[PDB]
Amino acid sequence: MHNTLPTLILGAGPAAIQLAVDISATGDARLGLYNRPSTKGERLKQYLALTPTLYLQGTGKAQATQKESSVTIDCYIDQLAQAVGDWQRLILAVPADHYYAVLQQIPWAALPQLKSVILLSSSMGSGLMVQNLLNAAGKRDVEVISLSSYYADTKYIQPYRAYTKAFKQRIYLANQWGNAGSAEMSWLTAVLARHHIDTLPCSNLLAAERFSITNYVHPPLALADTTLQALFYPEQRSQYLYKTQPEGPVCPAVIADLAGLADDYKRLLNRLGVEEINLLRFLNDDNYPVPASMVSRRWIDEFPQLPPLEQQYALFVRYTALLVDFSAVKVATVYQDANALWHLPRVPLEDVHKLRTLLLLAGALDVVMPTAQRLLQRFQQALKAFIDRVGEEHCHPSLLGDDCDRQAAIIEQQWRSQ
Template sequence: MSNILIAGTGPVAVQLAYIFTTERHNQVDMVGRAKYSQRSKRFCQAYHQQQQQLEVTVQNNQHQALSGRFRIHHLYADYGDITQTATMNHYDTLVLACNADAYISVIQQLSQRIIKNLNHIVLVSPTIGSHMIVKQLLVELNKQVEVISFSTYIGDTRVMNETTPNQVMTTGVKKHVYMGSTSNKKESDFMLKMQRLFEDVGVRLIALDTPLFAESRNSSLYVHPPLFMNDFSLDVILNGSDVPVYVYKLFPEGPITMALIHEMRVLWQEITLILEKLNVPSLNLLEFMVKENYPVRNETLSNHEITEFQKLAAIHQEYLLYVRYSAILIDPFSKPDINGKYFDFSAVPFKQIYQNEQGMMQIPRMPYEDYYRTTIIQQIGALVGIETPMINRFLQRYALHISKFVEGHTEFEYSEQFQQQYFEADVDLIKSYLKNVSH
């Protein structure tokens, strides 16, 4: 790593920029979309108004190594500004700190000269198959480029004040994040360098055999579709609610019912069948939830039930998943107050549709990002011969709610997010990639 271009100007990009600048030999640049995004424009303005400084703070003292005030080498307001630079930089690493559905667009906005010189591309928040899309997209321009997929972003970073988006806070950090490379794990010097760099700031990166293996180790892929693509949640996201309701609460305070848990289990099984076709080890969903996301008390679930989860009967699996969500309604490890109240861990409100600066209605990242991810998984299933009736149900339900809302609210202007999408360009690249790999 030496010359690094980070695509994105959001809080994730700022935190990653800080991590990469802790290695003094690295030159780190960032690029935004100020012409098309008011958020990116505000970021660029704040950056220049505050002496071209960026800042990361942390919520918890144990994460102090991730915090600091720093400078990057250069911030480009737009992708076109890079190609117009008189002395164009030679970047060896591109970090895609943007949504997975934007990977094609970002790469296509970069000049061929930049693409041809890249040695590594890092996918920070991919879905299953994202590395195939990127690798196939570059098959003509840079066939040798190494693509590294993270399982997910390292934690939770957010802008605390919209007027200073160059200052962000990391409120939580995962115990570890998985990554996989299109190069052989043992031959990837870049992954070793990444591991050392992130270890220095207290983040453990675990190298897996393939990027597909890493991409499948994201619990959101398995739990977000049932949590967000049900009638209760979609109605709240589109129409609001008279009383506060929350993503992770049991019905009627939230969407979680036994029917939702049933759909979650079936979704997990369908993804498991797809992964088996692609030679990726299956995921023990309950163990992943409890051991790698949010733990529960030993008194709540036995270790035997957790480790043997995949061998249990379907109704037993659903019972355990329901118990798990019941157990984290409160933070079971928080200290109760004098009235016996624990921290209300599950009180995460739904974000609703909103109008952007151009007056166009937008869908929040959840569930739109989940719509993209789930569609890609559905299409991969079709390509490898796996039927996905539950995934189909999620996507049909989502599309029905969106179309009904648009039909009933002709007073609004809508972004393309409100159109039914099949992400054909992404799917065609995956299809070509799988065809080439099989030969």
């Protein structure tokens, strides 16, 4: 029965604690957990070897369907070469820009009963990429499921304790066949239905991944000139990601980039055979709504046919209305690790990787994305200037390269094969 399948969760961020409780609440399944040997991973590795129990609390509205819970972990590993045995479901709970690096380390031959791979918070192209790797390992039978985003808001640091403040209202998902009635899809639905989360099946993996909010919203905000300056000059007074100038990036040019990047993704998706979303309807009706006195229902329903300038006005009004807890989101800065090496924070590092992969894919398909190109040009120039200030020898290698090129190639190969 699918709600008893031994399940290995790859990545032990706070979402994995919520997820683990949700699986254990839905059936009696053996649960495995992986986390890289960071300092946090090591402390959780030590803790679990003593008491293999994670703890979760529901908070605010989430308390309606999530109370104090505990869940047992039957196996914990910190090396993916140890991801072996009778596991039948892998769930990728690492960020999407790390799926490739993770999947390349899994010894697929040592997972003879593997049935499904779930992408907990996907990006556009994630599913095609994962299909391609699995097909190369002789795992074409395995069901690949992309979820449009993680289904909650969950936070820690005691690394075995988390709390969930809120659940999303809906998640879009799909497997590579567009088969809505699969046992795994039914299982996921049951898992999410415990928190009143609707599940909406899509025709293919990309047709679900297109509903990843952060691909639309983060790059314009996080890669604005003033946000990049806060990021790379850590001594400035803090900026806030969703506030208007001069406290944060929101302003007409930034909103123009938000609208233009949505235009770019429509171009890319359409080329890939996938319909574009209605960005404003998605933001308002699937994520966080604002009063109709600010953003009219006409603006929402007709957004894709509105002229650019009216699209922009509507989006500026939306983000203004939002701030009346978006106003608390700070812009994180570059930072040094224990070896004194400089890092980028996950915003924008993850967003740059996700968008670069898609920009490289678009170029391979003869699709121009001028807003995406402008955004990454601006980031890359600021990053180069930062590396020169601090010295390349003092930068973590993540600042100096990535494997977006190989990913775009893999995604292109898989898509053309269909």
